[PDB]
């Protein structure tokens, strides 16, 4: 499982809701059933996938969300980010401005995590069955 | 994950193809997406589900396959036995005669393995990203 991110839209202008601040992909090598991406950032308002990130100096905020085609917020206690089903090798996601905003000039630094959902096995005790054919 | 097996009888020494030698069940209490059953026995003809087992005395062989409704041979290099999707607590499987055979009365032993298929997240290394906003 591996992430890539490429930067988008960093001009000194208003950010529009949905503006891509970064575009990413997650790649999986093993048989898998789906994907999970999140930010290692403060979640806002009890949301799984809506975050506030901070400038390099710690003094300024930008509200963002993770999403894109096929991505759904992860439900339930402890949920983070978004999930998407699929067995294909790679899918794309975006980090987007969440609501129209004016933010302070600076370098904004954030952390993205991800995973591939891989079937694993929990084994039973092997059973040696003696069959009486008679 | 837990296995149980019970021998199944018939009307003589000829075991026709598909005749049951045993029926088992695999029980999975933890949240799971499916089931996997196999034998820890010699495989026949490079096929995941086909096995040959030994009598106690008399140097007799018995050829069997694992299967039953809802089970499919596991595909891929090193595939063992059969798999079946489902989230329910338990499913049944059969051990069946594989090909018509004339089998001497005796004890025939075979080791059955099983597992519950439980999704786990395989983590990517996290990525730091720097967004410069002017
Ligand atoms: Cl929205």
Q: Which tokens belong to A65?
A: 């969300």
Q: Which tokens belong to A13?
A: 């202008």
Q: B5 and B23 in contact (C-beta within 8 Å)? A: yes
Q: Under 8 Å CB-to-CB from B11, ≥6 apart: which residues?
A: none
Nearest to A115 among B7, B122, B127 (CB): B122
Contact check, Cβ <8 Å, A10/B134: yes
Question: Tokens 């949905």 map to which residue?
Answer: A18
Contact check, Cβ <8 Å, A131/B33: no
Neighbour count for residue B109 (Cβ, 10 Å): 14
Which residues is A108 bridged to in the sheet?
Answer: A55, B131
Closest among B70, B69, B75, B3 to B34, alpha carbons compared: B70
Q: What are phi and psi of B47, to 5 degrees?
A: -105, 130
Q: How far apart are CA A57 and CA A131, in angstroms?
A: 72
Q: How far apart are CA B134 and CA B61, in angstroms?
A: 78
Q: How far apart are CA B72 and CA B66, in angstroms?
A: 9
Length of chain A: 134
- Resolution of the determined structure in angstroms stands at 1.0
Q: A108 and A56 in contact (C-beta within 8 Å)? A: yes
Q: Which residue of A has its CA nearest to B123?
A: A115
DSSP for residue A18: T
Q: What angle do CA A40, A72, B118 make, to 5 degrees?
A: 80
Question: Tokens 């489902």 map to which residue?
Answer: B86
Neighbour count for residue A19 (Cβ, 10 Å): 19
Length of chain B: 134
Q: What angle do CA B89, B95, B98 make, to 5 degrees?
A: 145
Q: Which residue of A has its CA nearest to B56?
A: A130
Q: Under 8 Å CB-to-CB from B77, ≥6 apart: which residues?
A: none
Local structure of A32: helix, strand or coil: coil
Q: Which tokens belong to B120?
A: 């786990």
**Strands, DSSP E only, in chain B?**
2-7, 14-15, 20-27, 34-39, 42-43, 50-55, 61-67, 72-73, 82-85, 90-97, 101-102, 106-123, 127-133
CATH classification number, B1-118, choose in 2.40.50.1070, 1.10.287.80, 3.40.50.1370, 2.60.40.1570: 2.60.40.1570
Q: Under 8 Å CB-to-CB from A59, ≥6 apart: which residues?
A: A104
Q: How far apart are CA B40 and CA A128, in angstroms?
A: 9
Local structure of B116: helix, strand or coil: strand
b/e map B60-75, b = 16+ CB within 10 Å: bebbbbbbbeebebbe
Domain ranges of chain A: 1-118
Residue A1 C-alpha, separation from nearest chain B C-alpha, in angstroms:
5
Q: B15 and B104 in contact (C-beta within 8 Å)? A: no
């Amino acid at each position: 499982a591996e992430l890539h991110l490429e930067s988008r839209g960093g001009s000194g202008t208003q950010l529009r809701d949905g503006a891509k601040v970064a575009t990413g992909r997650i790649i999986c090598r093993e048989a898998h059933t789906g994907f999970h991406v999140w930010m290692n950032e403060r979640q806002v308002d009890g949301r799984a996938e809506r975050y506030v990130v901070q400038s390099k100096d710690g003094r300024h905020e930008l509200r963002v969300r993770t999403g894109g085609d096929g991505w759904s917020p992860v439900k339930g206690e402890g949920g983070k980010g978004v999930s998407r089903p699929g067995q294909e090798e790679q899918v794309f996601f975006d980090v987007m401005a969440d609501g129209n905003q004016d933010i302070a000039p600076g370098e904004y630094r954030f952390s993205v995590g991800g995973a591939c959902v891989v079937p694993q096995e929990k084994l039973a005790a092997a059973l040696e069955h003696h069959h009486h054919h008679h």
